[PDB]
Symmetry: D2
């Protein structure tokens, strides 16, 4: 019926949820407005997202809207046991825990495919692991699936690659590229959870350190800003000249890893790309350099090299390894190269996840309630809905939004109700 | 042949240009690479942009590429006399000076329409004043015009309105919405020139003051950040819930002008919208509140109200008026509500304008060299060219850009040469 | 008879040692002290009773003192601040330590009393943090005062107490104000809190900082850091203050400065840093927004009226250790961290090890100074020489790869100054 | 005989007055002084010779001193710092002022000499900024020293000189160090420079700050502000320093700290703030990037080797007043601002009027203190009482709508402190 580390944590879990709800006004309005309507009636939503306190509230929201949900984790150390327990206690099949093996991980996603009253008809994925599993292993269920929504940047890039090669057989909504997700989650989320992750693992001082951030997209920007705020000297690496110039214009030295590896005290990878930190970098690092990743998959840091070339590996505590190298110096690796904010901390705070997840619900609704508008392709949520997500969070922050007058709306040639920006606007 | 305030300033002008060139690597590469090719051969580019030191370098670049240029200003107090003089000294008809009347302003744009060897075949406008003049007054020249490029946000919004109502008869390239413009010019440009404008006019202390910024788009963001940096408490107003939430997430109180007018020491309008600061606001302002605008046209502040309701208007010096109100308190107005960074300072520094203008040249080229790709419509510059502009500025900043390996480029499914981002990416 | 020590779990010793090994690499100031003095053992014959948070950083300090030849017995200066694996590591090393996380007020007093007597005589040196060890001896063990050579005090509240004792003529032992060493006050209090405050809030609540209104009471060194950290994460910070100079500083930095009576209606997060009583009261609690987070980082739990929450709330739910969620008659909730005790050490690991190396290098120097040069220090409250203050900073420049400029002989003569310092006059504020 | 004054253009008086009217609204500290003392005229019989930048802000100070019943004669303390319309406004008010923008070194000395003698006796009070007026009298007019009741000194370089004179036994008049009033040092030097440095660079060059590498030499109060301002606009700031404590501060704030020998190869902008000679030399100039901007904001033009640029450059082109562009043998160019003189006042209008109100309120208090309570001040260098220091800050809280908290009687007794202050011990560094 489910699978977790300890059901006895459900009580504590429920508390952490009650607290989360006040921090998630977005998702609460959805429950407020759709509870009686039950738009998601008939939908069996198979989920593969980090089983956390924040996700628990999302899972319960989908249920409040009248759906059946089965949940797996998308990372083997991201799950929060007490959050997984409260959900499991509510009669909702959840298969996830903290510290899964790859075989265990794959085995979890498999339990969420089949419900009591039939296979899954909805995917809510991030990274596309569930998406790619059903496309490769279970292509006989693809026709039964009505729609899918993708949370993260790497997962939508994959959804664009599949569609191009004509192997994407199910319609999909790019939830990452809702402004309210990409511009808040990736940025402000990592901005607050990065250092938290590093701190819990190492308790290292950030001030006075040189920190090297590989990549300056939305995630890199947040990471950079955070480290800067605590008095680190931040060095950026980048392949994109536009992003690189943005970093230079903010006062960041922009150079290569081949150079930066020699002066960094702290290393954070955010590229979504392979081969970012390699043996030739490690060998040049200062003693007890702290290396961690916050990209979606654990492919940015060459962990294999450390395991193969170090003289000794000492485990300090879970998700914290200290390698001694043949040069005598040591490398502190976090979460074995898996994303550090969920691996060594609690991931993003509930408020920002409310934004991401208020998007996710609108996407699950729009795929199940209006399947017409969305044919087999990679689609966006309309700006007006994107605006509605943001608007829904203004109350809690005591933001007082201005309303255009008739005269002003005419002068601008837009509606008082929105949308207020053209589609190409970048905020 | 031309019209300026003083040709005797040309010598000083030339110096300020020689200095500008080192700060404008973007535009220098264009001269380096196209001088011999003369792609703009045959093009008579009528220009309506702020006649400044930065613009002078742009004008000369278009000439270096083999074009005939006639230049007018787009604002009546933005022109820099010594810059206008150096251009006029180089045998290039320029009709612009600092302190023009509306009749003088219109009269300037009119001289740039007709060259020695025929009418204009290219527009390089901002705000769309030249665009709208030729469409309304001289529709007989529209067919002779090959293409147009628009610098600023208000001007492209107008170019979208014209196309919608089917009155835009000439193809146009949205240069504002090149990432390299919108994300650098509007943001980093105003970030540095706003306070400069305010300082030269008033020399007021920013620290300890409450500053009210109306609008939180790219311009508002820059203004807000700047004022914050000097220790002002910044209050934002906004109509867009997405922008408003962005401001809240940066630590800015977001409320209405109706409230903020009561506590602001400094007022900056950035909306591009009418009726932002009104009589009911002025009456509530603290004594010697400094009010200024940095949107493109002078329609955001109700200057007419001040002139009609104040008990006395005292001029402190050019572009600085001090009104005494019937309540006894005083309002310090800058530049009569026209944009303050060009009115009371020198506008944006050359480096950022190099970015904007390296875009402008590519747009002038693409309209004159490849007219096929661009039919009557509002078009964007391709990302690869957008990336090239940024790349061209990395050298001067000693930025060392990373190059993807073959293996990495394959994994990402993109080219080593770019483009590195999908079209919907927002940076 | 006498327990050799008392800690939560001796089994945590191995883990603690690892944390000690890592910490050492971040505390060059103390490691230089060991290297320089391990052979000479200046603190030989010293019997130092230490009352100060039993963290990993303090462990490194303890072993430094021992390396210098001292005998050391230790307790924590707060009931929630001990880090059990660090305690175990010390206990396992054969050093008498009496501390664990979650002490009763009575157990806390007991822990201090076990540090007072050594196998070969009473304590003859004091290393204190808040004055609790200092007051206990002056009040309950005055016959031990002539046998104590000196006192070094870590924190602001503590040195304030020292100065009051001196003015009223009741301080009987010479003391060094370590808090007001430049390399402590301007670094520990400021930069340490700037990182550890958020740490304690996050571990306890995992709340989004961005978009919140945060009220910081007091704008001294601790307040400055706290405020900076919160605004850094996108919170709008409001400041309360009684000192017009500190308040003007806050305003000049772009903070709204106002009273708690006003700010209690706005804040989503409250942080007290005053070292003063009665900062947040019932009348404030009753006006707060729902699930307002309330915590203190001043030395003593006296700034927040927790007893009011306990007597007047209609519900009280323990969320997890050092996190309680009250509900008031108005039906709105208050989250209280660490029962009003200082939240960085209560709900997290306190200051990072690097900045603590500054503070603790000052502590070691002070101990050496009082122990080996008593006649320099008559009964009173003294500062370390600026020369030594500068040496502390210098000892940490290497790790950060700072390259310090050296004055030419001409420049030094122009400034009327020694090349080797001191480089500032006594009244310099940095 | 004796000119009543000498200024650039008396016609600029009307404009200056407007600027004076505006400035007054931003200088509550001085305007409170007028209101409180205009009737009592504590400075009656005083004959104050002032040597300090003749800006709009100083004008407001001058008229404040007169309102208090003083006779005042004024000159500028720098040859490029005078604001001619402000000078005209004062001259027109019938106050003898000798100052204009662009003085020769010889004219500068002449200007000071005209302030020394009044219609009814020699000067009996000194208000100085850098010690130039102080040194001139001690060296060339020692027979005037017994007739001078006191000296108030504005800036760091000046008070350094005062302390040296006292140590060597050559200072003959009592003096108040105004620079090291908290409300001066921690505000003027820091917040003022944070705004006026960029001002001077911008007016002179209009250069993009964002993306540039900026080298700030020295990290004291001036350096802190300068550095902060540059990084705020998106420059990557590199710091040089001789003091290990100041250097550690810089590092802790995320700045690269290194030597000028290293940084001269990287910087696009250079800013000296040391108050020390020989900061930027020929060997540094020769390694700089093309069109590197070089300026100083320390009090004297001694930090940059301008004479080297003048003797060794192959080209020198004046771009505009106080902006010269050199070319070296290597064919790369150097832009020098204000001929090495302090660039905020040289190429702009100096500090904004609000923060100068702090400094100048301290100046007025010092003048009153020395003039009406001489016996409090024997020959030496003294500080203002913290009570008065606090009063300065308090006088400026109203304009910023700061709401200061008042201690309850219980809180005050707990802190062992007066409700009306002073709220900090003497050694507090804020
Ligand atoms: N840990 C989390 O909670 C979390 C949250 C959001 C996103 N993510 C993940 O973070 C990664 C990026 O997210 P983003 O939204 O920042 O994507 P993004 O595309 O905005 O940023 C990626 C940046 O990496 C740069 N880059 C790529 N290869 C590089 C290389 N070899 N060297 C240097 N720079 C390189 C690109 O130029 C790009 O700017 C993705 O894997 C996404 O799934 C994680
Ligand atoms: N002065 C300069 O040098 C300079 C440079 C670039 C752009 N601009 C001008 O600045 C203006 C905006 O530029 P942008 O790129 O910032 O455009 P933008 O659309 O990003 O920002 C405009 C913001 O104004 C807000 N807004 C509109 N009406 C409002 C109202 N009544 N109250 C509050 N907020 C309101 C919108 O929500 C939007 O976010 C345009 O007029 C543009 O031409 C000037
Ligand atoms: N938890 C830690 O790790 C840590 C670290 C350093 C210091 N401390 C403690 O923190 C407290 C403050 O340290 P500090 O060095 O910042 O002291 P400080 O004296 O520099 O600043 C304290 C501020 O509180 C202000 N204040 C006093 N009463 C007030 C009131 N009723 N309302 C508002 N403001 C008020 C004072 O004016 C002063 O500015 C002390 O108790 C010290 O021991 C704790
Ligand atoms: N232009 C203005 O408006 C203005 C305002 C205030 C002060 N000042 C002047 O600015 C100068 C500094 O003022 P401050 O109060 O910042 O003095 P300060 O003594 O606080 O800091 C000066 C710094 O320079 C450092 N230093 C000395 N020699 C050095 C060297 N060779 N290399 C690197 N660093 C070195 C010192 O260590 C010190 O930290 C003084 O001359 C003062 O009069 C000017
Ligand atoms: N606490 C959280 N719960 C669920 N998903 C999260 C959390 N924090 C970050 N994420 C998501 O994890 C993904 C990274 O793989 C991103 O899409 C990001 O939004
Ligand atoms: N110095 C300058 N020269 C020319 N155009 C400028 C300058 N500074 C800002 N602008 C442009 O002015 C427009 C505002 O009307 C924007 O498009 C902006 O890029
Ligand atoms: N990690 C830590 N270990 C020991 N003492 C600490 C730590 N962090 C902060 N402190 C001390 O706590 C005191 C507050 O009571 C401060 O004086 C500070 O030196
Ligand atoms: N606008 C100004 N008017 C007068 N003096 C000023 C101004 N700005 C800075 N100063 C003074 O210049 C001195 C530096 O020589 C500082 O002590 C400072 O007080």
């Amino acid at each position: 019926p489910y699978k977790v580390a300890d059901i006895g944590l459900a009580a504590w879990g429920r508390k952490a949820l009650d607290i989360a709800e006040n921090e998630m006004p977005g998702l609460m309005r959805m429950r407020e407005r759709y509870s009686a309507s039950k738009p998601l009636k008939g939908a069996r939503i198979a989920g593969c997202l980090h089983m956390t306190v924040e996700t628990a509230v999302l899972i319960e929201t989908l249920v409040t809207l009248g759906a059946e949900v089965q949940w797996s984790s998308c990372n083997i150390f991201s799950t929060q046991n007490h959050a997984a327990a409260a959900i499991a206690k509510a009669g909702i099949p959840v298969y996830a825990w903290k510290g899964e093996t790859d075989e265990e991980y794959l085995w979890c996603i498999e339990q969420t495919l089949y419900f009591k009253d039939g296979p899954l008809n909805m995917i809510l994925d991030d990274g596309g692991d569930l998406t790619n599993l059903i496309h490769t292993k279970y292509p006989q269920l693809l026709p039964g699936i009505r729609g899918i929504s993708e949370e993260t940047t790497t997962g939508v890039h994959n959804l664009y690659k599949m569609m191009a090669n004509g192997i994407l057989k199910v319609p999909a909504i790019n939830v990452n590229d809702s402004v309210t997700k990409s511009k808040f989650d990736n940025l402000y989320g990592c901005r607050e959870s990065l250092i938290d992750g590093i701190k819990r693992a190492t308790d290292v001082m950030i001030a006075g350190k040189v920190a090297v951030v590989a990549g300056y997209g939305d995630v890199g920007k947040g990471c950079a800003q955070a480290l800067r705020g605590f008095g680190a000297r931040v060095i950026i690496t980048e392949i994109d000249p536009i992003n690189a110039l943005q970093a230079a214009m903010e006062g960041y030295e922009v150079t290569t890893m081949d150079e930066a590896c020699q002066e960094g005290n702290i290393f954070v990878t955010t590229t979504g790309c392979i081969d970012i930190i390699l043996g030739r970098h490690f060998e040049q690092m200062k003693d007890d350099a702290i290396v961690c990743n916050i990209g979606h998959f654990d492919v940015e840091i060459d962990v294999k090299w450390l395991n193969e070339n170090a003289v000794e590996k000492v485990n300090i505590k879970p998700q914290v390894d200290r390698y001694r190298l043949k040069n005598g110096r040591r490398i502190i690796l976090l979460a074995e190269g898996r994303l550090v904010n969920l691996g060594c901390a609690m991931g993003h705070p509930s408020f920002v996840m409310s934004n991401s997840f208020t998007n996710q619900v609108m996407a699950q609704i729009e795929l199940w309630t209006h399947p017409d508008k969305y044919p087999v392709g990679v689609h966006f949520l309309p700006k007006k809905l994107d605006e509605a997500v943001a608007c829904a969070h203004l109350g809690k922050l005591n933001v007082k939004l201005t309303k255009l007058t008739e005269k002003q709306a005419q002068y601008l040639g837009m509606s008082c109700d929105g949308p207020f920006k053209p589609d190409h606007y970048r905020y």
